[PDB]
Structures are given as C-alpha cells and as structure tokens.
Amino acid sequence: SYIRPCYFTNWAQYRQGRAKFVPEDYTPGLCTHILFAFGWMNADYTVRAYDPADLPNDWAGEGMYRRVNKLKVTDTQLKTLLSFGGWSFGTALFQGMAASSASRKVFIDSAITFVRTWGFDGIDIDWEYPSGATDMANYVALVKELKAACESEAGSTGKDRLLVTAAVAAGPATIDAGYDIPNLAPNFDFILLMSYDFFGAWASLVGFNSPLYATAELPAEWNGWNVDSSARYWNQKGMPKEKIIVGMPTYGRGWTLNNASAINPGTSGSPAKITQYVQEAGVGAYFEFCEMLANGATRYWDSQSQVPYLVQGNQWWSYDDEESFANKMAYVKREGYGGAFVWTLDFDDFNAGCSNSNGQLYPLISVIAKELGGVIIPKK
Ligand SMILES: CCOc1ccc([C@@H]2c3c(-c4ccccc4O)n[nH]c3C(=O)N2Cc2cccnc2)cc1
Numbered sequence: 001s002y003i004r005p006c007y008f009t010n011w012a013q014y015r016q017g018r019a020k021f022v023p024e025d026y027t028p029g030l031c032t033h034i035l036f037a038f039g040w041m042n043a044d045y046t047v048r049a050y051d052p053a054d055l056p057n058d059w060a061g062e063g064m065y066r067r068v069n070k071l072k073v074t075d076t077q078l079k080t081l082l083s084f085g086g087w088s089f090g091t092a093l094f095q096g097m098a099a100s101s102a103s104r105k106v107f108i109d110s111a112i113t114f115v116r117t118w119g120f121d122g123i124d125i126d127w128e129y130p131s132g133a134t135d136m137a138n139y140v141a142l143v144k145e146l147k148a149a150c151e152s153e154a155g156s157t158g159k160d161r162l163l164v165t166a167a168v169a170a171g172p173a174t175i176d177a178g179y180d181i182p183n184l185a186p187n188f189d190f191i192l193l194m195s196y197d198f199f200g201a202w203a204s205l206v207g208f209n210s211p212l213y214a215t216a217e218l219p220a221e222w223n224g225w226n227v228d229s230s231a232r233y234w235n236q237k238g239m240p241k242e243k244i245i246v247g248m249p250t251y252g253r254g255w256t257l258n259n260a261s262a263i264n265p266g267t268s269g270s271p272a273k274i275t276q277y278v279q280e281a282g283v284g285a286y287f288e289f290c291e292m293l294a295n296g297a298t299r300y301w302d303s304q305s306q307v308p309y310l311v312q313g314n315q316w317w318s319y320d321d322e323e324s325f326a327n328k329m330a331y332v333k334r335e336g337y338g339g340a341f342v343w344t345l346d347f348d349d350f351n352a353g354c355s356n357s358n359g360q361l362y363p364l365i366s367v368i369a370k371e372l373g374g375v376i377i378p379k380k
Contacts, residue, residue, distance in 0.1 A: 002332070002372035003190055003245055003339030006031035006365065007083070010038070010051050010064050012346035018353045019277035019285065021346035023067040027361055028075035029375040031342070035124050035165075035192070036068055038089065039082040039114070045097040046110040047084065069119035081122035081163060082115050094127040098138035101145070108142075108149045115162060116153075122163030123150075124192070129169050130178035140183045147187040167192040170230035170247070175237070182238035192341050193234060195227040195247040199318065201255060201271035201282025208265065208318045209253040211305030212328060217265040226305065227328070231337060242338040248328065250286050250347035250364050251278070252319025260314040265302060272315050278347075285347040286364055289319045290354035325364050329371035340368050352380040 012021035026034070040050040053060040062070075072078050085094065097107045111123050123146065130139040147164045154161035168191045169175050199207030199222075207218050211226045223229070227246060234244055255269030262268075271282040278285050289310065293299055297312035307324045310317045332340050342348070348364045349357060359379030360366055366377035 001032075003033065003341075004031050004368055004373055005033035005035055005192065005245060005339070005341035007035045007037050007342060007344045008068055009344050009346055010036065010054055012344070013053075013064070015277050015346075017277070018287070018351065019346075021350060023064065023071060025350050026071050026075075026345065027377060028071075029077075029373065030362055030365055030369055030377055031345075032077065032079065032339075032373070033122075033341075034068060034071065034078065034080045034345075035083045035341075036065070036080060036120065037083050037344075038086045038126065039084045039111075040089070041084065041093055041097065041107065043093070045093075045103055045106040047107065047114045065118040065120075079121040079163070080119070081124045081165060082111075082118070082120045083124040083126050083167070084111065085126035085128065087128055089126075089128075091127070091129070091131070094130070095135060095138075098130075098135065098142050101141070104138075104142050104145055105149075108146050111146075112149060112153050112162065120162075121160075122165060122189070124165045124167065126167040128167075129174050131174070132177065136178055136180050139178065140180050143184055143187045163189045165190055165192060167194055168234075170195045170198070170227075172224050172229075172233060175233060179237075181234065185239050185243065188243060190243045190245050190338055191234070191239060192245050193230060193247050194343075195230045196249040196343065197253070198222075198225040200253040204255075204258075204268045204270065206255045206257070206265065206267045206269050206316055208302065208305050208307050208309070209251075210247070210249050210320060211302070211307055212324075212331060213305055215265060215302060215304035217302070217304070219266070228331070228335075231335070241336045244337045246328070246332055246337050246340045248325065248340050248342045248364075248368065249320055250342060250344060251283050252286070252289055252317050253283055254315060254317040255282070257314045257316050263311050263316060265305075265309065267316070269316060272317065284317065284319070286319065286321070287347070287349040287354055289317060289321075290349060290356055292317070294355045320364065322363050322367055325367035326371065329367060332372065339372060342368065
C-alpha cells in the first residue's frame with residue numbers, strides 16, 4: 001500500500017474567513033497519516049506543546065491534539081504523528097539535545113511519554129538541518145536510540161511500537177553535510193523528502209517551487225534542484241525507495257517581475273505581492289491561485305519541469321494543481337517510490353470554495369488519494 005501522509009499545521013486556524021482551517025475540515029481517507037506541525041522542546045530537552053491551544057484548556061476547548069486525534073473515530077485506518085522541529089524551531093536546540101547519550105535520552109523519553117499521553121502513533125523529527133560531522137553522527141545516534149526506545153516501550157506495554165520518521169532535506173549540499181544515509185535508513189519507518197522550495201522569493205531568480213525535473217530554461221548549476229534528482233539522490237545514497245515519500249506542495253511561490261514583458265522561467269524579480277489569506281510575501285495558497293485564474297491570469301504549462309505557472313500583470317507564480325499532481329502520481333508509481341506526502345492540508349482548496357470548483361473537496365490532495373490510494377474524495 002502507498003503511504004499518503006499529510007501535514008496539519010496548528011496555526012492555520014488563525015487565518016481569516018475561507019482560509020481558516022481546523023481539524024474538522026479533514027475528510028476520511030484523504031490521508032493515511034497526519035503529521036502534526038509542530039511539537040516543541042524546552043531548554044532542558046523535554047518536550048511540550050508549541051501552541052497552548054494544542055492542549056485542552058478554558059479558552060481553546062478540547063485543544064488541537066484531541067481534535068486531530070478524534071479524526072481517527074471516523075477514519076479508522078488513519079495514523080497520526082507529532083512532528084518536532086520545523087523551520088522556526090531552528091538548529092541550536094537540536095544541536096544541544098543531540099549532543100550526548102544523556103541529552104538525547106531526556107528528549108527521547110519525554111517525547112515517547114508525550115505522544116502516548118496525547119494519542120499519537122509516531123514521532124517525526126524535522127531538524128532543519130543537521131550540519132557537520134558532529135551533527136551527522138549525533139543525528140544517526142538520535143534516530144537509532146529513538147527507535148530502540150520505541151521498541152522498548154512497545155515490549156514493556158504490549159502496544160504496537162511508535163513510528164519514527166523525519167522530514168529531510170532535498171538539496172545535495174545539505175544532504176551531504178548532515179545525513180549519513182546508510183546509517184539512518186535502518187531506523188526510519190519512512191522519510192518525508194522535502195522535494196519543494198527549490199526556487200523562491202528569497203532570491204531574484206524566477207523558477208519553480210517543485211519542478212519534477214530540471215529545465216534548460218534555468219541555469220545548469222541548479223540541475224539537481226528538482227523532485228526527481230532529490231529522490232534519486234536519497235535512493236543512491238542508501239535509502240530504499242519504499243521509504244522515500246515524495247513531497248507535494250499545495251502552496252506556490254511567486255515574484256514581482258523586474259520586467260512584466262519578460263515572463264520566461266529564468267527571468268528575474270523580487271517577492272510577489274502578499275496574498276490576502278496567507279499574508280506571507282512570496283507564497284500563496286492553491287485557493288488563492290484559482291481565483292487569480294478566474295480573474296484572468298494566464299496559465300502556462302512547463303513541459304520540461306512538468307508544473308504550471310501563471311502570470312497576472314507583473315506577478316509570476318509557480319504553483320501546483322490537479323494536473324501537476326496527476327503527473328507526479330504517475331511518476332511515484334512508475335519509479336517505485338513509497339508514496340507522497342503533502343505540505344499542507346490547509347493550502348489545498350479544502351472546502352471547495354474556489355469560484356471554479358466542481359465541488360471537489362481537496363482538488364489537489366484528492367489526486368493522491370485516488371491515484372495512490374484508490375480513494376474517491378467526495379464533493380461538498
Ligand atoms: C527557504 C525556504 O524556507 C522555508 C520552506 C518551507 C517552510 C515550511 C513552512 C511554512 C510555509 C511553507 C510554505 C508556504 C507558506 C509557509 O508559511 N510555514 N511554516 C513552515 C515550516 O516549518 N516549513 C518547513 C517544513 C517542515 C516540515 C515539512 N516541510 C517543510 C519554511 C521555510
């Protein structure tokens with residue numbers, strides 16, 4: 001069976017209007033696993049909730065942990081994992097936590113207790129990123145000792161052991177500097193390959209967020225910065241294909257063009273205008289792009305990289321859609337990878353609110369559910 005994870009983000013509930021996303025917007029069968037972004041860590045390496053609203057309390061109610069895990073009542077095949085780390089979390093705390101057997105044990109024991117208390121079936125590590133020989137060996141030890149402690153807890157209690165996964169870098173330099181892949185593979189149930197964010201508004205080069213392959217439209221120095229190169233790289237370095245879960249974005253990345261008459265991939269720009277709901281310069285959600293198209297933006301298909309882009313005046317957006325998801329699912333099956341995961345549930349048109357919707361909940365993620373899972377996600 002293909003593995004079909006999806007990231008839930010606990011901050012999407014703070015978006016306005018049609019963009020507000022809560023666990024009850026999930027629909028059964030959409031994912032095989034939900035990864036909860038994010039759990040947090042104290043200075044002493046014990047774990048805690050990132051957002052006080054994750055926990056049951058007077059002002060939040062049941063809390064996001066309980067609301068996500070309640071989804072298993074109506075989706076009995078669903079498993080959940082708590083993801084520790086992420087971009088904002090940074091590296092310093094991971095570097096300290098991973099430094100010794102004793103420091104790792106504090107975190108490991110605390111994380112196992114915490115996920116059992118709050119009803120998760122696994123621990124996902126999103127350290128961005130281990131870097132250098134010290135981090136590399138400490139990360140190997142962390143994942144090995146975490147799996148071992150999960151095996152020990154399972155034998156002690158008689159329960160199925162917690163899963164151990166990680167969201168991992170896709171760029172060759174970052175992979176080389178931080179990941180000892182042959183010594184990591186035995187101890188992961190699977191990895192979430194972050195095969196996206198290859199080009200973006202941190203730089204002036206206009207390119208694709210998640211091109212499936214390279215294009216000669218972009219400079220040759222970036223020929224490894226695409227989904228297929230990153231998946232091949234992990235496999236060649238020793239990760240079995242069945243453990244490589246290909247990353248799928250439901251957001252896009254965009255630029256304000258330096259010259260509105262120069263619209264080719266490989267042109268130059270600054271960040272796109274901030275979008276209404278995401279409120280982050282240079283990114284936007286699928287349910288924003290659908291309205292841009294309805295409002296007259298011109299859509300192009302890049303045949304080498306196998307992803308769309310759109311142009312609206314001086315705004316140029318790389319994004320993903322049903323068509324690019326479908327071709328990427330054909331790729332996953334043809335190349336034998338273990339599945340595909342989504343960042344995020346909340347950037348798809350989760351409520352079928354797009355003006356051009358045919359009623360389909362989750363038009364993008366539904367492609368994964370159908371092509372990899374045989375699941376037909378309903379219309380609203
Ligand atoms: C130079 C690229 O810089 C970044 C690329 C990606 C992220 C993503 C993200 C977003 C976000 C991503 C896309 C659009 C809008 C958003 O707010 N918001 N919080 C997080 C977070 O922690 N991320 C990391 C992550 C972790 C696990 C699995 N995949 C990704 C952050 C920075």
